[model samples]
Target: SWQTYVDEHLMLAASAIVGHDGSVWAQSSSFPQFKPQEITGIMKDFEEPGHLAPTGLHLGGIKYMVIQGEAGAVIRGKKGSGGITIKKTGQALVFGIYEEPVTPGQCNMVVERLGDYLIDQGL
Candidate 1:
């Protein structure tokens, strides 16, 4: 079911489900490099916005320019630089990564929709 978010659309190059504390619950095989420290830093960015602001958004070791989204709920990276979208749920964070032929908008919708679904289920 979850794998469909990445494989089915071909829009999201990769995706991951991480807890608030940065523990990864699941991630697409295409994103095996996913790291807890990277997500941990991301979670911090959501609350304070200092880390990723000066530098860039780092996911799986790749850095992309940050394009801020919903205050503390969402964040996106620049397009063509292997854009990234991350949505915060009640207990977890949903991530979406996209590249050429796919817009950041499409990736955001998928991840945010999944995030909403999880929130609805009180996850």
Candidate 2:
């Protein structure tokens, strides 16, 4: 279900669907392995925006600058390091990780669109 989203819909470098309780629901093979603390931190940010604003978003031990949007969160790595777009649905977080050649807006649009679909489906 999710591999197609990463490969076809968004052409994302990788993607994952994580539950609110930090469960790994679905993920692409290339999706990085995240530490328990890292996943915990992400959930904290959803509840308290400032939780991640100070240190940014960390995934697979890599830190990215946090840029919050009305839709959700967008994070950028260093120059040429790529970025990630995340959307919080009612029960899960949808992530779209993309690299160079993939515009941030494009990632955001795709991630948010899927997020909305998940939200509507009550996933």
Candidate 3:
């Protein structure tokens, strides 16, 4: 089962990306985990339909991108204070960044793109 896979290999899976500087990011866990409230506060400015807000943290970073109809939230990282803007509509969340503040836009783009790629590969 998927849950079994997660329990057995989440640490190994997380290690691949959460290096010394990098850390694991995630949303509210059924048990106990950090949540993304500051990021969600930022999302309140945007108005869009089917928008979902990211609510997780990794390596002390928050993810602000979400895909429509997706069960889990999308994780993203930036170097500086700039990246993408996420909006919440109904129960879904949308992503859009206006300026590059901290992390480079290209880097965020890569993270988002890579997430899609991993999903495609069933990782």
Which candidate tops TM-score? 1
Which candidate ranks first by lDDT, i.e. highest? Answer: 1
| Total clashes in model 3, counting residue pairs 3 or more apart in sequence or in different chains | 17
Q: Listing every candidate in turn, what is its Cα RMSD in Å to the true structure after a full C-alpha superposition?
A: 2.7, 2.9, 11.4
lDDT sort, best first: 1, 2, 3
The TM-score obtained by model 1 is 0.83
Relative to the true structure, how large is the alpha-carbon lDDT of every model?
0.78, 0.74, 0.34
* Order by TM-score, highest first: 1, 2, 3
Q: Give a tens-digit lDDT track for model 2, residues 1-123.
A: 556654565347887788878888878778889888987887777666667778878899878887655523433333255788778788888888888887777778778887888888988
Least well predicted 10-residue stretch by lDDT in candidate 1: 2-11
The C-alpha local distance difference test score for the whole of candidate 3 amounts to 0.34
Q: Which digits, one per residue and each the tens of the lDDT, describe model 1 over residues 8-123?
A: 64336788777888777777768647577787778888898656877887776787788767778888787465688888888998888888777777888889788987899998
Q: Using Cα atoms with residue i matched to residue i, what is each candidate's TM-score against the true structure?
A: 0.83, 0.81, 0.26
Candidate 1 wrongly placed segments (more than 4 Å)? 1-11, 79-81
